[PDB]
Amino acid sequence: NAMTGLFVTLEGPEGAGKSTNRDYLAERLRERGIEVQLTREPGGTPLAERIRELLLAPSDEPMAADTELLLMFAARAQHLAGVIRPALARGAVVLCDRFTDATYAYQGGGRGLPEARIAALESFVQGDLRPDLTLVFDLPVEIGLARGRLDRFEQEDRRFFEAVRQTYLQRAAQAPERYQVLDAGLPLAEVQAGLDRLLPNLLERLN
Numbered sequence: 001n002a003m004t005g006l007f008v009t010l011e012g013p014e015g016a017g018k019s020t021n022r023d024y025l026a027e028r029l030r031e032r033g034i035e036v037q038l039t040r041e042p043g044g045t046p047l048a049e050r051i052r053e054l055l056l057a058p059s060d061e062p063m064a065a066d067t068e069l070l071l072m073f074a075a076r077a078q079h080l081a082g083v084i085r086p087a088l089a090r091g092a093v094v095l096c097d098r099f100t101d102a103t104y105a106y107q108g109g110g111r112g113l114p115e116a117r118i119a120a121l122e123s124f125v126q127g128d129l130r131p132d133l134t135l136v137f138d139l140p141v142e143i144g145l146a147r148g149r150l151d152r153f154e155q156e157d158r159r160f161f162e163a164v165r166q167t168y169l170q171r172a173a174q175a176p177e178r179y180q181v182l183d184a185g186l187p188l189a190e191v192q193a194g195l196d197r198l199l200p201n202l203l204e205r206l207n
């Protein structure tokens with residue numbers, strides 16, 4: 001039937017080689033003549049980036065959990081219509097830094113919002129669309145490393161970030177067919193060799 005690309009999301013903390021690994025993946029794909037679209041959430045479009053700004057900017061006014069969740073999904077709705085679905089329809093590979101798993105992990109695990117409510121909004125915004133593959137970069141939580149000023153989420157405590165970590169691992173266990181957990185605590189080349197063994201699988205998913 002209708003045109004098909006490949007929707008890959010990457011999840012995990014910065015400082016875990018997510019970005020260099022995404023670049024690696026992108027170059028390996030592009031050398032094979034495949035169109036690759038790099039993007040990130042929240043953000044990805046002019047309006048979505050403005051929503052991002054509201055989400056990250058520290059304020060003395062506390063942001064309600066529901067506000068934070070609805071803003072995340074608002075940016076996502078804009079980003080899906082403007083960037084992601086159009087790329088997939090061109091048969092491109094989308095490599096998206098963070099997606100709805102981050103919502104489950106941060107807003108669910110970190111903020112304590114019920115999984116059911118996040119799931120309701122996921123279906124509302126996305127219909128049946130989910131990533132084809134989600135790469136989780138897992139390693140023990142590191143706090144305070146390489147830190148203008150801390151944004152809203154950076155200000156959180158170690159407990160918050162441990163809940164985020166564990167939620168990703170839980171999610172990957174609930175639907176193993178959609179995830180691959182990468183040991184981001186392993187040497188740099190050893191992880192990119194994992195990416196090599198992955199490429200053929202990606203290519204198959206794509207064509």
Ligand SMILES: Cc1cn([C@H]2C[C@H](O)[C@@H](CO)O2)c(=O)[nH]c1=O
Pocket residue numbers: 041042072098099100101102103104106107153154
């Ligand atoms: C995509 C996404 C990011 N975040 C956080 C993680 C980062 O701290 C920040 C920017 O990606 O926003 C969420 O809390 N929920 C989400 O759904």
